[PDB]
Design a protein around this nucleic acid. Structure first.
Ligand SMILES: [Cl-]
Ligand SMILES: [Zn+2]
Ligand SMILES: [Zn+2]
Lengths: 126, 125
DNA sequence: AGGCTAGCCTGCA
DNA sequence: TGCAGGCTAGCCT
């Protein structure tokens, strides 16, 4: 199972409750990418940590947030926190790489959630 | 508070969990009627049991059901059970009065939830 | 019949 | 003004 494999790459120490939510977050993404033929691309990006992977996109919602098991957040933040930066505070601490065509900031119809298409930045000064 | 007053007219015996759900049902209806200026009419129908009150309408959903908290049901059944018949089992046991212009069965854009616009009927079975 | 969530509304910083 | 969280109609199983 792809879900369990992807969960093995999860960052940080999680308690019982967070482990269950994290599993739901991965399941939710796996369902969306399976219908658009983007699942293999997610496995490649996560399991190899490769920046030279395609955009991994999901439809953008009106307010940009994604709800998973009663929790709401920005999906690129959710998946960057899960697989790269467990203490990631907000979207203000993420900047997309130059080659990311569907970065969150672009506000296109689709949003890229490939964590290796983002870089962590210090909280903006101004 | 109109919620506490309308809840005083609630029928049946309720435990702690049902009491909280019933309060949510009344709150949910009060919110909807406040925006359409029909709250005073609900107070009138519930406190006077007058069949000669206007239709108390809420927008009709695609499947007819209403969700209050995490429970789904037919809204005229919900509010008829709350204020008139606590052992009302289904919509099949209810029929709208002749003067009800927005009866559930009519399937109009708006649905009447005035309990005094409905009567109990023999179960079709 | 019942579960999940995007959109809607709302109060807070 | 953005940000956060409650509620539920529409959609799905
Ligand atoms: Cl792509
Ligand atoms: Zn990208
Ligand atoms: Zn009526």
């Amino acid at each position: 199972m792809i879900v369990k494999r992807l969960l093995g790459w999860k960052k940080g120490e999680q308690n019982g409750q967070e482990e269950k939510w994290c599993e739901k977050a991965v399941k939710s993404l796996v369902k969306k990418l399976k219908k658009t033929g983007q699942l293999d691309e997610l496995e490649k990006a996560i399991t190899t940590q490769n920046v030279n992977t395609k955009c991994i996109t999901i439809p953008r919602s009106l307010d940009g947030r994604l709800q998973v098991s009663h929790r709401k957040g920005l999906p690129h933040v959710i998946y960057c926190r899960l697989w790269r930066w467990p203490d990631l505070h907000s979207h203000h601490e993420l900047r997309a790489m130059e080659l990311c065509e569907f970065a969150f900031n672009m506000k296109k119809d689709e949003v890229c959630v490939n964590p290796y298409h983002y870089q962590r930045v210090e909280t903006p000064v101004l």
